Amino acid sequence: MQPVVVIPPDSGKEEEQMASESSKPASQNTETKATIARKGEGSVLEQIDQGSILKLPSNLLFENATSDAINQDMMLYIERIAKIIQKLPKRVHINVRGFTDDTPLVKTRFKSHYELAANRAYRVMKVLIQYGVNPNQLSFSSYGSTNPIAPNDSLENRMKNNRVEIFFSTDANDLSKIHSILDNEFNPH
């Protein structure tokens, strides 16, 4: 039951973990763990309303997080992505996106994180081309260091922060045309 003299202690970890279950009433999850080649782990596939994003931790592609040297053991992961892309129509555009953390670049040839990220995304794009993706469906982008995923306090988080993302989308304009036709017809301005 209870002591006859009840003296509550300070709020503790029991009370933290009980209230540490708070979350959104409508908890939807638009990410799934992805498996490249039945052996390529830590990747995720995310859906957003304008497209799909395949997120690849640094270590699935590059020999390190401050280099654009593709780890040759990982060439087969890029081949698998190329194969799947070749199963999409030529309508689909593929944007390879590079990201870095805040690691100092003085020991490398890179002068900026934007530059490092650009070279990483470019190299991945070029390997996709080697494996047959039409260059007319590809582009590369750099975000530099300012879109982190997690604090940079573990190897796993560092690999996420230095990820490459592959974004799949189209340039559909049917709704835009519809509005344009209506606007031209009805707006005096």
Where along the sequence are the contacts to its own copies (CB under 8 A)? 26-30, 47-51, 95, 97, 114, 118, 122, 135-136, 138-144, 146-147, 169-181, 184
Q: In the complex, what is the shortest distance from the CB of residue 65 to its own copies, in angstroms, rounded to a whole number?
A: 19
CB of 37 to its own copies, least distance (A): 23
User: Least Å distance between CB 70 and its own copies?
Assistant: 17
Q: Looking at beta carbons only, is 84 or 181 nearer to its own copies?
A: 181
3-state helix, strand, coil in the chain (%, to 5): 35, 20, 45
Nearer of residues 16 and 185 to its own copies, judged by Cβ: 185
Pick 109 or 179: Cβ nearer its own copies: 179
**Among residues 64 and 176, whose Cβ is nearest to its own copies?**
176
The number of angstroms, rounded, from the C-alpha of 174 to the middle of its chain's C-alpha atoms is: 28
DSSP 65-95: TT---B-GGGHHHHHHHHHHHHTS-TT-EEE
Distance, CA of 42 to CA of 173 (rounded, Å)? 35
**Smallest gap from residue 133 Cβ to its own copies (A):** 12
